[PDB]
Amino acid sequence: EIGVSDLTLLSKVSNEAINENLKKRFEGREIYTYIGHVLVSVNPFRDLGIYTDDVLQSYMGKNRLEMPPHVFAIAEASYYNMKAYSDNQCVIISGESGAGKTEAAKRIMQYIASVSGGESGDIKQIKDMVLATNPLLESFGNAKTLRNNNSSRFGKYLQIYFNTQGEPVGADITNYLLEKSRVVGQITNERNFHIFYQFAKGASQQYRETFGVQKPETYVYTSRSKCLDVDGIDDLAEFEDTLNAMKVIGLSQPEQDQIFRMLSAILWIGNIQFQEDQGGYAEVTDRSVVDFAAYLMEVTPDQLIKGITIRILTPRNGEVIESPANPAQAQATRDALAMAIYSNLFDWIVERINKSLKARQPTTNTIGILDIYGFEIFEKNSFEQLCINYVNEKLQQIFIQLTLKAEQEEYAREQIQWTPIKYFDNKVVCDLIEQIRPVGIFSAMKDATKTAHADPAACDRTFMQSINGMSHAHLTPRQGNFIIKHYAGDVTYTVEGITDKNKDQLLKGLLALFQHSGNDFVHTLFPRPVDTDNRKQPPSAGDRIRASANALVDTLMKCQPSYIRTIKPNENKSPTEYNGPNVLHQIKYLGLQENVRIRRAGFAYRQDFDKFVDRFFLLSPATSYAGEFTWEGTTEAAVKQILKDTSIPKEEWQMGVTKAFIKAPETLFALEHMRDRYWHNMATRIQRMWRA
Amino acid sequence: VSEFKEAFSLFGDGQITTKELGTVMRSLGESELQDMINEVDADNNGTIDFPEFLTMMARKMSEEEIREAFKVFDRDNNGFISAAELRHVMTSIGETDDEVDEMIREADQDGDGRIDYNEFVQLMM
Ligand SMILES: Nc1ncnc2c1ncn2[C@@H]1O[C@H](COP(=O)(O)OP(=O)(O)OP(O)(O)=S)[C@@H](O)[C@H]1O
Ligand SMILES: CCOC(=O)/C(C#N)=C(\N)c1ccccc1
Ligand SMILES: [Mg+2]
What are the C-alpha distances in Å from A650 to residues A134, A424, A606, A614, A661? 49, 35, 16, 21, 11
Q: Is A387 in the pocket of ligand 2 (CB under 6 A)?
A: yes
Count of C-beta atoms within a 10 Å radius of residue A304? 25
**Quick one: A438 and A336 in the same domain?**
no
- A447 and A540 assigned to the same domain: yes
Q: How far apart are CA A590 and CA A597, in angstroms?
A: 13
- Residue pair B29/A687 in contact (Cβ under 8 Å)? The answer is yes
Q: A183 CB less than 6 Å from ligand 2? A: no
- What are the DSSP E strand ranges found in A132-248? 142-145, 148-152, 155-162, 168-176
Query: What are the contacts of A100-104 at 24+ separation with CB within 8 A?
Result: A100/A41, A100/A43, A100/A566, A100/A568, A101/A152, A101/A371, A101/A372, A101/A374, A101/A564, A101/A566, A102/A138, A102/A142, A102/A150, A102/A152, A102/A371, A104/A41, A104/A71, A104/A564, A104/A566
Q: How far is CA A85 from the centre of its chain?
A: 27
User: Alpha-carbon distance B88 to B67, whole Å?
Assistant: 19
Sheet holding A489-494, edge to edge: A475-478, A481-486, A489-494
Active site residue A376: yes
Q: Where are the alpha helices (DSSP H) in B16-124?
A: 18-28, 31-37, 50-60, 63-73, 83-92, 97-107, 117-124
Expressed in angstroms and rounded, the spacing between residue A549 Cα and the centre of ligand 2 is 16
* Residue A413: CATH number of its domain: 1.20.58.530
For residues A409 and A515, membership in a common domain is answered with: yes
User: Would you call A689 and B59 a contact, using CB atoms and an 8 Å cutoff?
Assistant: no
Q: Is A502 helix (H, G, I), strand (E, B) or coil?
A: helix
For residue A636, what is the domain's CATH number?
Answer: 1.20.5.4820
Q: Quick check: B58 and A647 CB within 8 A?
A: yes
Test site for ligand 2: of A334, A393, A504, A507, most ligand atoms within 8 A of the Cβ? A504
Query: What part of B 83-102 touches A (C-beta under 8 Å)?
Result: 89-90, 92-93, 95, 99
The SS3 assignment for A213 reads coil
Burial of A242 (0-12, 13-18, 19+ CB in 10 A): buried
3-state DSSP assignment of residue B79: coil
The rounded distance, in Å, linking the Cα atoms of A321 and A315 is 8
C-beta separation of A197 from A149 below 8 A: no
CB-nearest to B1 from A647, A674, A686 is A647
**A406 and A515 assigned to the same domain:** yes
Q: Are the C-beta atoms of residues A198 and A135 closer than 8 Å to each other?
A: no
Q: What radius of gyration, in Å, describes the C-alpha atoms of chain B?
A: 19
Residue in A653, A686, A690 to test binding to B, most B beta-carbons within 10 Å: A686
Active-site residue A384, yes or no? no
- The answer to whether A11 is a known catalytic residue is no
The reported resolution of this PDB entry, expressed in Å, is: 2.7
Residue A61 annotated as lining a ligand binding site: no
The residue in chain A having the minimum alpha-carbon distance to the alpha carbon of residue B96 is A689
Q: Which residues contact B19 (CB under 8 A, 6 or more apart)?
A: none
In short, whether A474's Cβ falls inside 6 Å of ligand 2 is no
User: Which of A40, A103, A573, when mutated, tests ligand 1's pocket best, judged by the most ligand atoms within 8 Å of its CB?
Assistant: A103
Rounded to whole angstroms, the Cα distance separating A127 from A537 reads 43
Q: Catalytic: which of A151, A222, A225, A624? A: A151
Other residues' Cβ atoms within 10 Å of the Cβ of residue A175: 19
DSSP class per residue in A417-468: ---PPP---THHHHHHHH-TTTT-HHHHHHHHHHT--S-HHHHHHHHHHHHH
Query: Are residues A330 and A401 both part of a single domain?
Result: no
CA–centroid distance, A564 to ligand 3, in Å, is 14
Q: Which of A667, A682, A691 to mutate to test the interface with B (most CBs of B within 10 A)?
A: A682
Q: Does the beta-carbon distance from B59 to A666 stay under 8 Å? A: yes
Domain residue limits at A324:
257-344
Cα separation of A557 and A19, whole Å?
Answer: 31
* CA-based nearest distance A39→chain B, Å: 21
A410 and A545 inside one domain: yes
CATH number at residue A264: 1.20.120.720
Please tell me whether residue A673 adopts helix, strand or coil conformation.
helix
CB-based contact B103 A669, cutoff 8 Å: no
Determine the Cα angle at A360 with ends A355 and A361, to 5°: 145
Instruction: Clarify whether residues A474 and A335 are in a common domain.
Output: no
Active site residue A509: no
Say if the Cβ atoms of B66 and A627 lie within 8 Å.
no
B64-81: b or e for each residue (b if 16 or more CB lie within 10 Å)? eebbbbbbbbbeeeeeeb
Residue A369: CB atoms within 10 A of its CB come to 25
Hey, are the CB atoms on A673 and B59 less than 8 Å from each other?
A: yes
A93 Cα nearest atom in ligand 1: 21
DSSP A324-380: EPPHHHHHHHHHHHHHHHHHHHHHHHHHHHHHHT--SS---EEEEEEEPPPB---SS
Ligand 1 near A99 CB (within 6 A): yes
Known catalytic residue: A151?
Answer: yes
Task: Answer yes or no: is the C-beta of A569 below 6 A from any ligand 1 atom.
Answer: no
Q: Is A505 in the pocket of ligand 1 (CB under 6 A)?
A: no
Counts of helices then strands in chain A (DSSP H, E) = 28, 21
Q: Are A340 and A402 in a shared domain?
A: no
CATH architecture of the domain B1-61 equals: Orthogonal Bundle (1.10)
Experimental method: X-ray
